[PDB]
Scaffold this active site. Structure first.
Site, mmCIF file in Angstrom:
data_model
loop_
_atom_site.group_PDB
_atom_site.id
_atom_site.type_symbol
_atom_site.label_atom_id
_atom_site.label_comp_id
_atom_site.label_asym_id
_atom_site.label_seq_id
_atom_site.Cartn_x
_atom_site.Cartn_y
_atom_site.Cartn_z
ATOM 1 N N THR A 95 0.812 -1.197 0.000
ATOM 2 C CA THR A 95 0.000 0.000 0.000
ATOM 3 C C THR A 95 0.859 1.266 0.000
ATOM 4 O OG1 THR A 95 -1.710 -1.218 1.205
ATOM 5 C CG2 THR A 95 -1.848 1.236 1.233
ATOM 6 N N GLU A 96 2.057 1.160 0.558
ATOM 7 C CA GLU A 96 3.003 2.274 0.697
ATOM 8 C C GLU A 96 3.849 2.551 -0.533
ATOM 9 O OE1 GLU A 96 3.577 4.479 3.028
ATOM 10 O OE2 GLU A 96 2.505 3.743 4.813
ATOM 11 N N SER A 97 4.438 1.501 -1.112
ATOM 12 C CA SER A 97 5.349 1.735 -2.240
ATOM 13 C C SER A 97 5.143 0.821 -3.476
ATOM 14 C CB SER A 97 6.808 1.640 -1.782
ATOM 15 O OG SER A 97 7.127 0.326 -1.389
#
Length: 330
Positions: free
Chosen positions: A187-189
């Site tokens: 979800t972050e990167s």
């Protein structure tokens, strides 16, 4: 927490201004957590990897020999070895290096359907794109030439494969589920090791050195804060981020008794802060946990997914939870 942040703040401003002068304000594109963007050729050429939807778009606004400008970037991008600690996505310097193991190897194939690991195949593939896939656009004032390359359909799984061992280690070490770790990371990167935010989050798990980074070092009796190089090291990063996940779970949100309610809270807190999550239920950290400990986990998901004050955080919980439901079953 430095003059590092401030010298870096200025470089940011300077970098963006150099792009603006050449592409026009509406065409200012910068590296992000889920987007690699590397300028070369005195800001005339940029190489953009969108890790979220699997596209490699190579662009140039150079007026003379644009096809020549594009060829150079295509080959280096396809062949670049990842050492993200050594790559400056906030300068037009060519610090791109060709290794025996391209970062994109297996994530893209040439027009003959083969993965690309040598300079020959990359060259043949560049010439093909330049002869058959050369696009042209107007920014209102000047012509941008480009090549789009689509990655293999399963590029996300292929890229996450690079970090599953590191996830298994951190998971057994800190008591955090692999599925939560990958879901946060995705979800972050989208498993981008060059990930950089404008909230100063670094690396695969988008670790903010000065808050979460510092906090994790202290929890383990370490001094100082993690360096920039440290957080662009995948194993260091995944270890640090998973440590913060465990910290949110044990100390900051530990008053939550139901483990599935705690996770919803931990996930939200990872993006928005532990403070804000509790403050959704009451200004008293103790009462807030007491309210949560009397409601079902589905209410808690529903409460956070609607009544949390950051729009970003509300989306974040839905995204991570979705991601985790496809990593949890084995």
């Amino acid at each position: 927490w430095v003059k590092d942040t401030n010298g870096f703040d200025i470089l940011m401003g300077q970098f963006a201004h150099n792009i603006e002068n050449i592409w026009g304000f509406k065409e200012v594109v910068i590296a992000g957590p889920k987007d690699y963007v590397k300028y070369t050729d005195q800001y005339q050429t940029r190489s953009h990897i969108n890790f979220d939807d699997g596209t490699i778009t190579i662009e140039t606004i150079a007026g003379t020999e644009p096809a020549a400008h594009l060829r150079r970037a295509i080959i280096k991008t396809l062949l670049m070895g990842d050492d993200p600690s050594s790559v400056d996505l906030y300068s037009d310097v060519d610090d791109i290096t060709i290794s025996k193991e391209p970062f994109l190897y297996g994530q893209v194939v040439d027009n003959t359907g083969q993965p690309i690991r040598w300079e020959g195949r990359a060259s043949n593939f560049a010439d093909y794109l330049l002869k058959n896939r050369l696009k042209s656009r107007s920014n209102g004032l000047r012509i941008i030439y480009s090549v789009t390359i689509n990655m293999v359909p399963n590029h996300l799984d292929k890229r996450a494969h690079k970090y599953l061992g590191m996830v298994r280690q951190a998971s057994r070490k800190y008591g955090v589920d692999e599925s939560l770790i990958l879901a946060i990371m995705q979800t972050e990167s989208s498993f981008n090791p060059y990930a950089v935010s404008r909230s100063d989050a670094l690396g695969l798990m988008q670790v903010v050195q000065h808050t979460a980074g510092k906090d994790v070092f202290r929890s383990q009796g370490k001094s100082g804060t993690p360096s920039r190089s440290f957080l662009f090291d995948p194993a260091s990063n995944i270890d640090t981020g998973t440590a913060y996940l465990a910290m949110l779970n044990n100390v900051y949100l530990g008053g939550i008794d139901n483990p599935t309610s705690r996770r919803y809270a931990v996930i939200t807190a990872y993006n928005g802060g532990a403070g804000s999550v509790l403050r959704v239920f009451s200004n008293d950290k103790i009462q807030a946990a007491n309210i949560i400990n009397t409601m079902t986990p589905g209410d808690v998901y529903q409460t956070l997914t609607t009544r949390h004050p950051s729009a970003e955080s509300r989306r974040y919980l839905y995204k991570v939870n979705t991601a985790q439901k496809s990593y949890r079953r084995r």
